[PDB]
């Protein structure tokens, strides 16, 4: 193989793997640091590590700090990859973020040219910059925020955002994105929300967040 220990789904694709599904990647190409991830090899040029999937409400996203740090779920179905994994992957180079949204036969997407997640000491501080696409720039509001769960609030929050809005996120006061919100919940701000596409009173049926090196575009 071109990359015997591929460090992301873009190296897996460059190895000649063109089918979406589960692949073993190796953090910093280290054989001792295997991670089985879902690769989206068909959307927008492929080579994407999927790190969030919402599609049917079968999985619980109203989970504590430890669950969000570690990851949870079947990576073939609804899941969250884990903030420690996102920190280690985004530290490997310069990654872009893609968000794919589908609802009742309508589709939209967002791309952010720069996406990184800080380590646990930073409470997994979000960097998200350079919007393009059709879903609307709802992540800009969240740029610079630490992560919060119902059991770990911030010293800057007016309300417990995770408790109030039935999820976990890089909340401010509180969100324009709530993709780890409560499935099918059209109550204001409580659902699978992307404000600049469907507002706060519309829970989206299908959402994926995914990342790959930004240089893959060229």
């Amino acid at each position: 193989l071109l990359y015997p220990f591929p460090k992301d789904c873009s190296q897996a694709m460059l190895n000649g793997d063109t089918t979406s599904g589960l692949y073993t990647i190796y953090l910093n190409g280290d054989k001792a640091q295997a991670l089985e991830v879902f690769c989206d090899m068909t959307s927008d040029g492929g080579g994407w590590i999927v790190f969030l999937r919402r599609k049917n409400g079968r999985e619980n996203f109203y989970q504590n700090w430890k669950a969000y740090a570690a990851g949870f779920g079947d990576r073939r179905e609804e899941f969250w990859l884990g903030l420690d994994n996102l920190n280690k992957i985004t530290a490997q180079g310069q990654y872009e973020l893609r968000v794919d949204l589908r609802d009742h036969g309508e589709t939209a997407f967002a791309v952010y040219d720069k996406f990184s997640v800080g380590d646990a000491k930073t409470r997994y501080k979000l960097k998200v910059e350079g919007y393009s696409g059709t879903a609307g720039d709802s992540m800009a509001y969240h740029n610079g925020r630490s992560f919060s769960t119902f059991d770990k609030d911030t010293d800057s929050a007016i309300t417990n955002c995770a408790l109030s809005y039935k999820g976990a996120f890089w909340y401010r006061n509180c969100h324009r994105v709530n993709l780890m919100g409560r499935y099918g919940d059209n109550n204001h701000s409580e659902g699978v929300n992307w404000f600049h596409w469907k507002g706060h009173e519309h829970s989206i049926q299908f959402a994926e967040m995914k990342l790959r090196p930004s240089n893959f575009r060229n």
Partner: protein, 68 residues
């Protein structure tokens, strides 16, 4: 109305024009809680977008503005 005028004057100052008056003002995008961050859409003719944000600091609730 006094608060809307202060937002409109703040927007002109941050852009720098001489503020005359507010033509139109609408708030949109807040989550459904008291003291939620909100965007003001101001017509003053010019169209301005001004954040009104809230944060706790040492258990005190603080309020600040940003020109979008």
């Amino acid at each position: 109305s006094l608060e809307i005028e202060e937002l409109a004057r703040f927007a002109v100052d941050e852009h720098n024009l001489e503020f005359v008056r507010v033509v139109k003002a609408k708030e949109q995008g807040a989550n459904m809680h008291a003291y939620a961050d909100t965007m003001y859409y101001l017509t003053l003719l010019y169209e301005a977008k001004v954040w009104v944000k809230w944060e706790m600091s040492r258990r005190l609730m603080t309020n600040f503005k940003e020109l979008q």
